[PDB]
């Protein structure tokens, strides 16, 4: 509440002391349960480590850095920022808190960039990265996360004012490091938003092409069944045969590839019956095409339509989690940069309501430990298959 030293106006509303501690606890419970489940599924349930799970497992590592500090953080907010712990416990908590935020920001982009190449550029060299190469990338990206946040271990803590454990970054005017801080968030924000746009755009296109081929197939058969001309059926099978050949090249399955062989072959048989004036004998042969697509095709259409739906769901939650967790604190920090430049630090009451917003959006930053489990769930069908086979045992 009182004006701190070195031109620093800080406020501790009662809403922060009363509402945030139980929020920190809920984020601690679901975060430990979700990441603990992920840690079990990643490391013990499945034995195959792909390049995507290696990049994705870093979020689990980045989340446990915040999970460890959450009980201590609760102890600080209930004590009104009275840091009962020592010097070293405070430096480590600030380091791990920044390591969790900066680490989650970086690896949520790597997850989006990885899925961007799996979808948009399937044949690019970055899709064939070895597990050792992906492990080198993750280590190099952790080394970057170290350097950006290692400075929080140099400053001695706490600071008497009762002792407070905080890196007062909301009392620093906009300078070079603060510009770096904003750029370290907006470049990943631009990459994730662009990748999410391209992936959703490309995947909704593939689904629209599958349903367009399947539409022209069922629709054309209804023409053949309702046909009263011998020439109408010759042209109707033409659009079907072109649709059956387009669907073969679209699929990026052993019993589904040979199903189009039988599908096209049955069209060729009725194609000869259509050219011989067999109006009734070609309309009937076209009904055998209804029994082959149910047994052979419709299953692969639903499997791919679900694979596409889960991929779009995955890239959306990665973008949504990145925004609703890290953007609110950024906007508030930008508003403080303006007020320090506009109003200065003579009258502190200009920062009363803004400080309440900062610690509110600060708990949004801590939400990434209970929302990353949602990212893990939609990453691969192995996660829902873990709980489905676990519930199979009843
Ligand atoms: C930082 C500000 C100044 C610099 C701003 C730079 C902005 C563009 C960056 C990268 C584009 C290239 C990567 C993403 C799109 C290209 C994908 C690619 O490489 O695809 C190749 C090929 O199509 C596969 O088959
Ligand atoms: C349990 C060990 C499984 C293999 C190692 C997984 C990574 C462990 C970690 O770094 O937390
Ligand atoms: C080299 C250019 C660096 C650009 C950094 C990121 C761009 C956006 C920067 C902040 C936008 C709002 C500015 C914050 C308060 C500015 C007050 C001031 O004039 O000092
Ligand atoms: C809007 C500001 C972002 C501008 C930067 C890059 C272009 C990204 C396209 C817009 C994001 C689409 C939202 C989404 O589908 O996730």
Numbering used by the authors: 11 to 171, 174 to 264, 277 to 418
The authors write:
In addition, HCA2 plays crucial role in nutrient sensing and anti-inflammatory effect using various signaling mechanisms. Here, we report the cryo-electron microscopy structure of the HCA2-Gi signalling complex with the potent agonist MK-6892, along with crystal structures of HCA2 in inactive state.
In parallel, the crystal structures of mutation induced inactive HCA2, which were expressed in mammalian and insect expression systems, were both solved at 2.7 Å resolution (construct ID 8519 and 3378) and share identical structures with RMSD of Cα atoms below 0.5 Å, with no differences for the bound lipids. The engineered HCA2 molecule is not capable of binding [3H]-nicotinic acid based on saturation binding assay or mediating ligand induced signalling and it is likely that one of the thermostabilizing mutations, S2877.46V (superscripts denote Ballesteros-Weinstein numbering), locks HCA2 into an inactive state. Comparing the HCA2 receptor in different states, upon activation, the agonist MK-6892 forms close interactions with helix V and ECL2, and initiates substantial conformational changes in HCA2. The helix V converges in extracellular portion about 4.9 Å (main chain) and moves outwards in intracellular region, while helix VI near extracellular region moves inward about 1.9 Å, where MK-6892 binding pocket shrinks with the movement of helix V, as represented by W1885.38, H1895.39, F1935.43.
